[PDB]
UniProtKB/Swiss-Prot annotation, chains A, B, C, D, E, F, G:
Assembly and binders: Self-assembles to first form a non-lytic oligomeric intermediate, and then, a mushroom-shaped homoheptamer structure of 100 Angstroms in length and up to 100 Angstroms in diameter. Interacts with human ADAM10; this interaction is required for toxin pore formation, disruption of focal adhesions, and hly-mediated cytotoxicity.
UniProt key word Acetylation: no
InterPro entries (alphabetical): Aerolysin/haemolysin_CS, Bi-component_toxin_staph, Leukocidin/Hemolysin_toxin, Leukocidin/porin_MspA_sf
Mutation effect (residue 246 to I/P/R/S): Nearly wild-type oligomerization, hemolysis and target cell binding
Function: Alpha-toxin binds to the membrane of eukaryotic cells (particularly red blood cells, RBC) forming pores, resulting in hemolysis, with the release of low-molecular weight molecules leading to eventual osmotic RBC lysis. Human RBCs bind much less alpha-toxin than do rabbit RBCs. Heptamer oligomerization and pore formation is required for lytic activity.
Free-text comment on this protein's domains from its UniProt entry: The mushroom-shaped heptamer is composed of a cap domain (comprising 7 beta sandwiches and the amino latches of each protomer), 7 rim regions whose protruding strands may interact with the membrane bilayer, and the stem domain (52 Angstroms in length, 26 Angstroms in diameter) which forms the transmembrane pore.
Protein name: Alpha-hemolysin
Pfam families in the record: Leukocidin
Any GO BP annotation: cytolysis in another organism
SUPFAM superfamilies the UniProt entry points to: Leukocidin-like
Domain of life: Bacteria
Cell compartments where the protein resides: Secreted
Gene Ontology CC: one annotated term: extracellular region
Length: 280, 280, 280, 280, 280, 280, 280
């Protein structure tokens, strides 16, 4: 990248001959089961025209994948994490601005193949034309929500999943006979409904074992600011969907409702640029 | 590259034993939702015969993917980002010149395969001849617009997209029955038109979540210039297309109009070579 | 990662110009055959706002794959390791907190391919539509159990196995004629039941030769704590399943019972932050 | 390479413990739209027996892909860049010589596969013999023209292109019905001829957005030369082909004429070895 | 690994600013043809709380692949190395413990692919469902035998082999007509039995040319031990199988007997921690 | 390589703490169009027991691919470079010896695949056996001719080429109807013979644009030699084949004659070990 | 490897802060055409308990691929290199021992794939079961012959070769009609027998152009030995096979005889540990 313009590698980078004062802040929200981790670092370069503060948003959001309620032997429910989010807002009153952030949206790709085969038989000369298209489909998509001057956020959504090594079912899939089969253990089952759900081990790890974020947001502040202090708010949250299945006297049918429950864990941090330390 | 001519690696690069004064400038255009970031760096080498200034054009352009208007239950519209652009113009009056830039146009590639199979049966001896051709098709193409002495620009266009895991539709696709099906959720749908659009999550991330540029333009100025100051203009913009679909009493039909709306965000920066700092 | 924000590589890392006092603690639980290894390291940075202690949880858990009992020539049993676990709990009374941990849950992936071929014959014009989906299936899955402020744990489960190069059988597989064939050497066998089990060499290595963990948990403590001492508990364990097979007078039938035996090996370690050493 | 002869890496390279005086020279030929960039570097080693001067020939040649003229609604023309060239000549009078250059011609490669399958049916025993051959086909080929003592040149030619994801058409392709279909948007079109050309976005980037060279030519001069000064000439150029298509009352037909227009941009540079600087 | 917890690379490693006293000990057991090599190294860190001694168990075990005896022209035998082992035991009396070891058991993997193709003919609409599963099968498996506090061992077993580019035969394979064909040169042979064995060159190299181990076992000792001396025993061995084949008057038949001969080469080494040298 | 014997990387290499006096010698043979480049380097190590001199044989041999003569409209000829060579001889009188050289002969490789498929139909149970073999076929082979004490040489030969994306024709190919079709543009052509040759652009680059060698030969001389001077001869050459094609009144026929013309360019260099410089 | 035990990379390696006295010895055996090269290095570490001497066995063995004799126009012969060897023996009287050596035997690998496809037709429900197995087959195998305390040797054998892009023939192949076709240019040829052999260019390079070894053998000697001097013997050799083919009045038949000629080139070197130099 930088070496392609004939500039020596690392010349344009910053942080040289400086003393970065790092730190760490761990919080746990037992009500929502959302481990928090806000590792930061104050990079003060005399060459750079503004101060820096890279905020690492590590942590973990519990999957919370369990049957919330059961109604008899012919009806049951399941709540699973539809999407995890990590928002890092900054009051519009303050003069600090977010400079960069990572990861960011990337351009997809797909391979296209074309075929043209014709043969002869002894003579029924035939012709065949065919084209195939392939691409990768991650189970969860790390989408960077549109950032602005004071707010930056990420989200992880549910792309689709393969059930019992058959079919990439998704939230929008529907089958007139069986309905949505996203987490349906057996089709013509005879077992109790509450225990007719795909085992969490078979499902994706993030659904039950949780999602561990890893995001960065470097925020710069003017060096001649009147007040060297800016509070920041960091928000985690997960969105859960209710997956209902019931027996139609012939086979199980399953339905999924999108964005049923949403729980947000908000924390406020005070940054002291002069002291180069931010406190919980 | 450089090591192939027997020259020691990094010998021909510049920026050694020098003090680059980097910087940062963040602006947000809430009217157009276009985050801006003009990280720069002043590389002053005494060996090099001219001054340097590498301008990083980071930032983000919001996708702006939403149904702008709906007309009844049989007609609706959708505006999506057809192409993002980043232009970095320089007044022709000034004597500074752009030296390099990155990324640049690259040569495509494709694999070609040929087949020749003939067998016998017991005897209907047959012969088969076939050839296949495959290549990668990115959803968005990063095309570097033709640069000149005072102006350099980039653009990102819409190559094509795969809808519902079926067919790489593009802006020019047309089907006599259904028309352009670029963002058509369902063919024989019975739902309201305003809500018959492909979910933004299913579509590419750049359409709704925005595009984050990353470009570089090193501009050099004569060391004995009469005036050590040159203002520069940096322009972001996105081009949106209107995607109309209506019901023909039998099935949905969709049409796409190219380059319907264009919104440009222009900023002017003043560069002070003597002070080695450029201000907003 | 860090270099993408234009920050020099390693600037935000910690541990510079400091003297880490490492160590080692080896224990063997001959009753359960679980080798233990708690290599640690005390990273005390004056820049960092808290002390650090990275605990490596190396060791080994014996597979314990043997025929526990046999009942005649028509019935036998087999106990195999269903899942290994490594838990690192910390008393809620103490003020130390776990900061990070590794490895962590990762997002799966799968390739999707679509085909569309139509030809002509001389004319029985045919059409073919087909799609294939492929993905990797590790025998054992390293799932990170939901962590919290005081407790972090890992587990390794039995995804599935290929028997005699035919079929990826798993714990839930069932065949009405033969039943679960997870470890069935021969279908229409005539040998003694106790010796009709898949040879441990043919099976996966972890089943019989054991599993060697490799996990890390960095725990940070406030620098101004009233008492510089916190005891910690580290737990290994394995879960074994009973695999019964018997003769139905026509062919062997096998059944598997999940989570039959569980054996836990617990050790308590005292950490002395002031001395920078933790003793068994 | 060098390490395979047991010689320490970099021992045989040059440029150590020396002060290379680099530089830069930017010119723009608005008449032909050919950005120029002649970044150089004077490597003076006391160990090496001759002076060195590596000339980087960066820049850009505009694609110039547009419909030059239209004659009614049944005839039109198109001029596209057939091949870009970069020549670096040196007067035969001077005593300086070109030592090395990069890139250089490389040996192609291809995979060959052979098959032999015979089966039986119950018995019409058949036999099948088949072989397939695959290789990569870049759209543009970077051919290094035969160099000599005083002249070195490169050229980039048009290998072939894939049109509408169907067929790798080239300049020599011909079809009796439709003719050369290199840039034919539609076969049985009914639109005006001037607007029946493949969209430049669909075509390769280099055709319309231009080609950015990157070449190196190290030239050495005797250290005891009578005069320490040698002027050099650097030439860019592009060759354009006229692509005519007309309507035959039943379908469009297209023809291509090779090497219709050629425009050369020549610049002369004076090198001062004693001063270690070359001026425009 | 270590860099993922934000810790600088190599911070948690040991051996810095210390003087390791390495060594070497070569022995040859001409009776069993087992070259021995016990390269060691005494890593004494003042920061580490215990001494270290990494024992490299290099060497070589001869294949010993030859026809041990022949009985007429219709019966012959062959002894081949079924499995190589390397054991490093330590007397239970001593207080030294093994800390780590390498290589260790690794989790296998396999790719699973599913297909679903249905077409139409003009109309005999057909449907096709198919799934394929692929995985790698090394000829020899390096299994780490269950380690303990005082004993660590490795073994290399015979997974399977491909004979005459046809079939991956193994020790358990059986064919009612020909029997086990692991090393059967020809099926309907007419040559003497003693010379009807697969040429050792065609077979795997390890069978005849031997196996060269490469293993490591770091053992730590308390720094305040009463006596600074611990003797160690290192054992090599190979297990050979007798492969008998005889003529049944119509075709050759081969049978394999497992673990026929076992030869162990044991050596005892005395370690002097105070002197930092261990003698044969 | 060296690190596998536990020796620190680069320990056994030479050239440390020494001053290598490099150089350069450029010659051009306008009669044969063979650019020459003999970059050298005198590595004098006091630890090494002999002097060293690595001779780089860079340069370029022009392709010389043109129709040498035409005889009417039914006969024509073509001369193309059959093989390039680079020989570096040393007089047998001198006491200097060649120590090493690079590149060297490498062992080829090929993948072998075997298949065995049998199915049933409802029942015409069939069986299919098939095997495929694939390998890479470079157009030109870099063969190192057998070296000796005083002479080392390389050669590049014509393996085969693919013509019009159909068939890998070679010098030995023959077809009874059309003959050798190595460079036959059209089969049933009606154009003049002199202009019925494959365009040089379509052919391989080395045929017309030339071949650029890159070879190394380190030669060592006794340190106590009576005379510190040894002259050396370096020879380039190309071998050209005459490709004749004529019309048989029905179709073109082509024939190739091997090794028709050979042109050698020889240069003699005098080496002065005491002065550490070799002159043209 | 070493870093996995938490030991810093390179800690356990040797050769630090020491002065290795390298060397070189070149010999040529014109009688057998076997270039010799015995580059060595004396690594004397004060930490290591024994001296070291790594012997590089570079060189080259000429292929010697030519028709040794011809008997009329219906019989001819060909001698080709069946296998190259490099032996490095050491007198049993001396006390020096070989410590290590490289390369060493490696474990092969192969991929196994299984298929199971069943479809329906409208209904002739069919079932298909198939498995494929693929692996790489180098033309020449570098087998390390069983080493011992005083002797270490390598050999390179002839695995198999592909003739005319058809069939991997080997020394053991036999066809009742044509016989062994290893080097048979044409089957139903009518040319003289002496000139009916596969062109050496088409064959593998090592057969005619020779094989260039690259082997290492580090030998250690006790530091308190009574005499600091040990002579060593290094042996090259090649084994040639006689390939006879004759005409049976209908087609060519070829036969191969294994190990017809063997030529050994032996050299004796005297090592002076005290002087740290070994002389020819």
């Amino acid at each position: 990248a930088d070496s392609d313009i004939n500039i020596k590698t690392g010349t344009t980078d910053i942080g040289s001959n400086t003393t970065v004062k790092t730190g760490d802040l761990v919080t746990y929200d037992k009500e929502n089961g959302m481990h928090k981790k806000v590792f930061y670092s104050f990079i003060d370069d005399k060459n750079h025209n503004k101060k820096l503060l890279v905020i690492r948003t590590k942590g973990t959001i519990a999957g919370q994948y369990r049957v919330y309620s059961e109604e008899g032997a012919n009806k049951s429910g399941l709540a699973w994490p539809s999407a995890f989010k990590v928002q890092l807002q900054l009051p519009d009153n303050e003069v600090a601005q977010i400079s960069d952030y990572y990861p960011r949206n990337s351009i997809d790709t797909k391979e296209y193949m074309s075929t043209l085969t014709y043969g002869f038989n002894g003579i029924g000369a035939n012709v065949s034309i065919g084209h195939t298209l392939k691409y990768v489909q991650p189970d969860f998509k790390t989408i960077l929500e549109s950032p602005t001057d004071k707010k930056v956020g990420w989200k992880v959504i549910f792309n689709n999943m393969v059930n019992q090594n058959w079919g990439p079912y998704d939230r929008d899939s529907w089958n007139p006979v069986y309905g949505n089969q996203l987490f349906m253990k057996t089709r013509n089952g005879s077992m109790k409904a509450a225990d007719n759900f795909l085992d969490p081990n078979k499902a994706s790890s993030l659904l039950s074992s949780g999602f561990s974020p890893d995001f960065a947001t470097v925020i710069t502040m003017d060096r001649k600011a009147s007040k060297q202090q800016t509070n920041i708010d960091v928000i985690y949250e997960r969105v859960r969907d209710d997956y209902q299945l019931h027996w139609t006297s012939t086979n199980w049918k399953g339905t999924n409702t999108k964005d049923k429950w949403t729980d947000r864990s908000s924390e406020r941090y005070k940054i002291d640029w002069e002291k180069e330390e931010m406190t919980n």
